[PDB]
Design a protein around this ligand. Structure first.
Ligand SMILES: C[C@@H]1CC(C)(C)C[C@H]1NCc1cc[nH]n1
Length: 150
């Protein structure tokens, strides 16, 4: 009973979370996961500001209302060379990574590591936060409030 959550730097409070190294989060699970980080799904305006401060990924993830990839530098294998907040338009499938927004984070780039899931609930799952630099924090808990996601 283990969940790995790989997290990124924050840019204007926005960050990316990938679960178990695969696209595996539903929209309901995404909202619960951001709530466990005392965060919310970013609005499109919050994501655009994060992009302007240096945020980009090569992964689809939920924001409020859409599934997107923020891109600064054109890359053929990330959002097909697009720049800006690329919005996924057509897909058969429902599981992606997520973005989260924490209003208390620094205004610009914050590339310090994340050392807690502060709003996780009591539960039996070993949840490990994994940073890009490999540093980890593990705790026993739960964050899902919908049964279809368990
Ligand atoms: C609860 C917040 C969620 C976060 C934005 C991922 C970080 C955390 N704030 C503490 C902190 C600041 C740098 N590392 N940890």
């Amino acid at each position: 009973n283990q969940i790995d959550l790989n997290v990124t730097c924050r840019y204007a409070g926005v960050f990316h979370v990938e679960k178990n190294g695969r696209y595996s989060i539903s929209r309901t699970e995404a909202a619960d996961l951001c709530q466990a980080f005392n965060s919310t799904l970013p609005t499109m305006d919050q994501m655009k500001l994060a992009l302007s401060k240096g945020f980009e990924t090569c992964r689809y993830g939920f924001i409020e209302g859409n599934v997107v990839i923020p891109r600064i530098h054109p890359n053929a294998i990330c959002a097909a060379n697009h720049t800006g907040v690329y919005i996924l338009v057509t897909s058969n499938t429902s599981h992606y990574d997520t973005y989260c927004f924490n209003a208390s984070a620094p205004p610009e780039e914050d590339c310090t590591s994340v050392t807690d899931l502060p709003n996780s609930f009591d539960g039996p799952v070993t949840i490990t936060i994994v940073n890009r630099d490999g540093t980890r924090y593990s705790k026993k808990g739960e964050y899902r409030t919908h049964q279809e996601d368990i």
